[PDB]
Design a protein around this ligand. Structure first.
Ligand code: CKE
Length: 216
């Protein structure tokens, strides 16, 4: 059976929480987070990858205007690599693509998508693969000002996907099952940059509607 609790932060698969600023690059941080997890799993090394590389170079996405994680993974595969954060620093603004092979830190062989709305499939992926990129409805004031506990709001709309984050684990808190989510709004947001979101509560906030992970 799959573990009843998994927390990749404890296994050293997760880099520190970042702050995306005003740029709508949540999709880039979500993608990089998933790649960072696979890189650690494959090479045993953990390092910050470049979301700016993705913002400036994934032509299929809209830079600071938004984009999909699947398109980001496809880029890394076709481009044959993505630079480290140190080599291509985050600025928080769209600029011409400056990718350079010299700073390459990871590669990608493709990606897989989680069946729409299937939390059991998402659980399997987090348990057997690692951190997974996911999209959610983060438009509610209750989410914006989250501080502690298992987040659940009857007003969340699973069809209103407007933000991308990273699932780095799952567990239970005071009898309530949850997903451990890494956001990209800085360490001062939520619980040191993280939020626990309701698990197995009918795909709350659309947690399993647009999930995917990279193949390495
Ligand atoms: C995260 N900070 C963030 N900010 C703004 C977002 C806008 C969108 C919606 C969106 C815009 C553009 C695209 N691409 C370009 C056009 N092609 C046709 C499709 C891809 C995709 C999506 N998002 C998304 C919300 C849902 C999760 C992914 C990001 C924004 N996210």
């Amino acid at each position: 059976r799959a573990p009843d609790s998994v927390d990749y932060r404890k296994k050293g698969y997760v880099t520190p929480v970042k702050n995306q600023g005003q740029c709508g690059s949540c999709w880039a941080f979500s993608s990089v987070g998933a790649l960072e997890g696979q890189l650690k799993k494959k090479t045993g090394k953990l390092l910050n990858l470049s979301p700016q590389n993705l913002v400036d170079c994934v032509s299929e996405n809209d830079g600071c205007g938004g984009g999909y994680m699947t398109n980001a993974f496809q880029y890394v595969q076709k481009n044959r690599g993505i630079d480290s954060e140190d080599a291509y620093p985050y600025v928080g603004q769209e600029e011409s693509c400056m990718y350079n092979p010299t700073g390459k830190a990871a590669k990608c062989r493709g990606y897989r998508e989680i069946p729409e709305g299937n939390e059991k499939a998402l659980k399997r992926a987090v348990a057997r693969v690692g951190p997974v990129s996911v999209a959610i409805d983060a438009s509610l004031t209750s989410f914006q000002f989250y501080s502690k506990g298992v987040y659940y709001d009857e007003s969340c709309n699973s069809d209103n996907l407007n933000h991308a984050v990273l699932a780095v684990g799952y567990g239970i808190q005071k009898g309530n099952k949850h997903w451990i989510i890494k956001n990209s709004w800085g360490e001062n947001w939520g619980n040191k940059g993280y939020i626990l979101m309701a698990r197995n509560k009918n795909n709350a906030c659309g947690i399993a509607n647009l999930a995917s992970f990279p193949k390495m």
